C-alpha cells in the first residue's frame, strides 16, 4: 500500500492512498464508498469491500482524513494474545471509531496513536489547518514514532508505503522513492487532489496489486473520490 | 478517469444487523461468496478455522459492537457461516492473509 498526506502553498491538506492486495479480479467488484449517516447527515465517509465493516480509508467532514497501511512486525501469537487476553481492537475498526467519535484532527491523532491494537499498522492522518499531517507508526501497545509535516522547513508531504521511514526502503519493493520523486516534481504550488491522483498513478506506486486509489481533503469533503484500477 | 467506485449510504440509526442490507441488495451475493472462497481457501490454515469456530462464542462478545452485529447481519443475509465472516473481517489480525 501507499498513503500520502501533503500541504499546498495555500495551507490546505490533501490525502491520497493506494490499496494494494492480491485477488483484484474479485475485490475490485466489491469496492464501495460508504457515507455513514447519523440522523440523516453524513457523519463520515469510508471505502471498503462489501462484506468488510472496517475502514482502511475514511474521512470526517471538515475534521480529518485517515488511511492505514500494513506493517509486518511481530508473530502470530502476539496478535492472538493481544486479541484474546489483552483485549486490543482490530486495526481497521479503530480507524472507523476515530472517524465517528473524534471531534477534531488533534483528537484523532491521539485516539489512533494510543488505543491498543491487535497488530501493527501505519496510520496516516490529514487535517484542515496547516501542518496537520502525520504518519503514526504503530505498535500493538502504542506509537513507535510520530512523524508530522514540516512545511516551513520544506517537508510539505509525508509518504508511507509499508516500511519504517527512518530505515532505508527495500530495493526489491521501493515505491517510496517514486512517490517522492513525483511529489518533488509536482511541487507545493501545483498540489491538488488531481495532482495527488497523478502521483498515485506512477509505476510502481500503482502496481499489479493495486485495487483502488482514493484521494480526499477533509477541508473540501465533497471531492472524496475512489477510482477502481484496471478492472 | 477510471470508473468511480459505487457510492452507497449506511444509516447508523438502523440496528447493526440491518445497516448494510440496503447496500447488499445492489449486489449478486454469489460474487461476494465467490471472493471469500478464493481468498480464504488460499490462505487460512485449518487450525485457525477450527480455532475461530471454537471461539465464535467469545469473539462475538468481547469484540466491540456494532462491528460484531454488522458482520452477523450481512452473514445471515448471505447465508454464510459467521466464523468465516468474522475471519474475513479479522483478515489483517490473523496475519495469514
Ligand atoms: C492493510 C490493508 S490490506 O487490505 O491490503 C491487507 C493486507 C494484508 C492482510 C490483510 C489485509 C486486509 O486488511 N484485508 C484483506 C482483504 N479483505 C476482504 N474483504 C472481503 C469482503 C467480501 C469478500 F467476498 C472477500 C473479501 S476479502 C479485508 C481486508 C481489507
Ligand atoms: C445519501 O444520504 C444523503 C444524506 O442523507 C442524501 O443527501 C440528501 O438528499 C436529499 C434528496 O435526496 C436532499 O434533500 C438532502 O438535502 C441531502 N442531504 C445532504 C446532507 O446532502 C443522499 O441523497 C443519499 N443518497 C442516496 C443514493 O440515497
Ligand atoms: C485470536 C483468534 C485466533 C481467535 C483470531 C485472530 C483472527 C485474531 C487470529 C490471530 C492469530 C492467528 O494466527 C495465525 C497463525 O498462522 C500461522 C500459520 O501460517 C489466527 C487468527
Ligand atoms: C526532494 O526534494 C527535497 C528538497 O529539494 C530533497 O531534500 C529531497 O532529497 C528530494 N527527494 C527526492 C527523492 O528527490
Ligand atoms: C438463504 O437461505 C434461505 C433459506 O432459509 C432462503 O430463503 C434465502 O433465499 C437464502 N438467501 C440467499 C441470498 O441465498
Ligand atoms: Cl461507528
Ligand atoms: Cl517523505
Ligand atoms: Cl500482520
Residues of B in contact with A83 (CB under 8 A): 90, 93
The three cell numbers locating residue A207: 502496481
Residues of A in contact with B17 (CB under 8 A): none
Give the residue from B77, B60, B63, B65 showing the smallest Cα distance to B21.
Answer: B77
Task: Look at the alpha carbons of A113, A118, A119, A125 in this order and tell me if their dihedral is positive or negative.
Answer: negative
A212-227 burial by CB neighbour count: b if 16+ within 10 A, else e? bbbbbbbbebeebbbb
Partners of residue B80 on adjacent β-strands? none
The 10 Å Cβ neighbour count of residue A165 is 16
Any B CB within 8 A of A146 CB: no
The three cell numbers locating residue B97: 492473509
Partners of residue A4 on adjacent β-strands? A16, A159
Q: What are phi and psi of B43, to 5 degrees?
A: -145, -40
Which run of H or of E encompasses B77?
A: helix B67-78
- Pocket lining: A177 vs ligand 4, CB cutoff 6 Å: yes
Q: What's the CA gap between A197 and A176, in Å, rounded?
A: 15
Partners of residue A35 on adjacent β-strands? A45, B9
Kindly determine whether residue A34 and residue B35, on different chains, have CB atoms separated by under 8 Å. Answer: no
Give the residue from chain A lying closest to B6, CA to CA.
Answer: A32
Residue A21 makes CB contacts below 8 A (sequence gap 6+) with A27, A209, A211
Nearest to B35 among A23, A93, A100 (CB): A23
Q: Which long-range contacts (CB under 8 A, 24 or more apart) does B63-71 make?
A: B63/A89, B63/A90, B64/A89, B64/A93, B65/B16, B66/B12, B66/B16, B66/B19, B67/A53, B67/A54, B67/A90, B67/A93, B68/B16, B69/B15, B69/B16, B69/B17, B70/A53, B70/B16, B70/B17, B70/B19, B70/B20, B71/A53
Experimental method: X-ray
Q: What's the CA gap between B4 and A67, in Å, rounded?
A: 19
Q: Which ligand is nearest to the CA of A93?
A: 6
Nearest to B67 among A30, A93, A121 (CB): A93
Note if A1 is an active site residue.
yes
Give the residue from A59, A42, A57, A36 showing the smallest Cα distance to B10.
Answer: A36
Q: What's the CA gap between A92 and A54, in Å, rounded?
A: 5
The 10 Å Cβ neighbour count of residue A63 is 20
Q: What's the CA gap between A66 and A99, in Å, rounded?
A: 8
Cα Dmax for chain B: 47
Q: What's the CA gap between B21 and B24, in Å, rounded?
A: 5
Percentages of chain A per state (helix, strand, coil), in multiples of 5: 30, 35, 40
> Which positions 162-181 of A are in contact with B (Cβ < 8 Å)?
none
Q: Which ligand is nearest to the CA of A147?
A: 7
Q: Can you say how many angstroms the Cα of residue B90 is from the centroid of all Cα atoms in its chain?
A: 9
The DSSP line for A43-112 is: EEEEEEETT--S-SEEEETTTEEEEEEE---S-HHHHHHHHHTS--B-HHHHHHHHHHH--SHHHHHHHH
Mutation site for A-interface testing, chosen from B14, B95, B96, B97 by largest number of A Cβ within 10 Å: B95
Any A CB within 8 A of B57 CB: no
Nearest to A231 among B3, B11, B71 (CB): B3
Structural domain boundaries in chain A: 1-231
Burial bucket for residue A140 (CB in 10 Å: 0-12, 13-18, 19+): buried
Any A CB within 8 A of B37 CB: no
Task: Look at the alpha carbons of A23, A25, A29, A35 in this order and tell me if their dihedral is positive or negative.
Answer: positive
Residue A147 makes CB contacts below 8 A (sequence gap 6+) with A134, A135, A136, A137, A158, A165
**Resolution value (Å, 1 decimal):** 2.7
Amino acid at each position: 500500500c501507499t498513503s500520502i498526506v501533503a500541504q499546498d502553498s495555500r495551507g490546505h491538506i490533501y490525502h491520497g492512498r493506494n490499496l494494494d492486495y492480491p485477488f483484484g479480479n474479485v475485490l475490485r467488484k466489491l469496492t464501495v464508498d460508504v457515507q455513514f449517516l447519523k440522523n440523516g447527515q453524513i457523519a463520515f465517509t469510508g471505502t471498503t469491500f462489501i462484506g468488510y465493516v472496517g475502514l482502511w480509508t475514511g474521512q470526517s467532514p471538515h475534521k480529518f482524513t485517515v488511511s492505514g497501511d500494513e506493517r509486518d512486525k511481530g508473530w502470530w501469537w502476539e496478535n492472538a494474545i493481544a486479541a484474546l487476553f489483552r483485549r486490543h481492537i482490530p486495526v481497521s475498526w479503530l480507524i472507523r471509531a476515530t472517524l465517528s467519535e473524534s471531534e477534531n484532527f488533534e483528537a484523532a491523532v491521539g485516539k489512533l496513536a494510543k488505543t491498543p491494537l491487535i497488530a501493527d499498522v501505519y496510520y496516516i492522518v490529514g487535517g484542515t489547518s496547516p501542518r496537520e499531517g502525520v504518519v503514526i507508526t504503530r505498535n500493538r501497545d502504542g506509537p513507535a514514532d510520530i512523524w508530522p509535516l514540516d512545511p516551513l522547513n520544506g517537508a510539505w508531504f509525508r509518504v508511507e508505503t509499508n516500511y519504517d521511514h527512518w530505515k532505508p526502503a527495500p530495493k526489491e519493493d521501493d515505491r517510496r522513492t517514486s512517490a517522492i520523486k513525483a511529489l518533488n516534481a509536482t511541487g507545493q504550488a501545483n498540489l491538488s487532489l488531481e495532482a495527488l491522483f497523478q502521483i498515485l498513478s506512477v509505476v510502481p506506486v500503482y502496481n499489479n496489486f493495486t485495487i483502488y486509489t482514493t484521494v480526499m481533503s477533509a477541508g473540501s469533503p465533497d471531492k472524496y473520490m475512489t477510482r477502481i484500477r484496471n478492472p | 478517469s477510471p470508473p468511480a467506485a459505487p457510492r452507497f449510504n449506511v444509516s447508523l440509526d438502523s440496528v447493526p444487523e440491518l445497516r448494510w442490507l440496503p447496500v447488499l441488495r445492489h449486489y449478486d451475493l454469489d460474487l461476494v461468496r465467490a471472493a471469500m472462497a478464493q481468498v480464504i481457501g488460499d490462505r487460512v490454515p485449518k487450525w485457525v478455522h477450527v480455532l475461530i469456530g471454537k471461539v465464535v462464542l467469545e469473539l462475538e462478545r468481547f469484540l466491540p459492537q456494532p462491528f460484531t452485529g454488522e458482520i452477523r447481519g450481512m452473514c445471515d443475509f448471505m447465508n454464510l457461516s459467521l466464523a468465516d465472516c468474522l475471519l474475513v473481517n479479522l483478515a489483517y489480525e490473523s496475519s495469514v492473509f
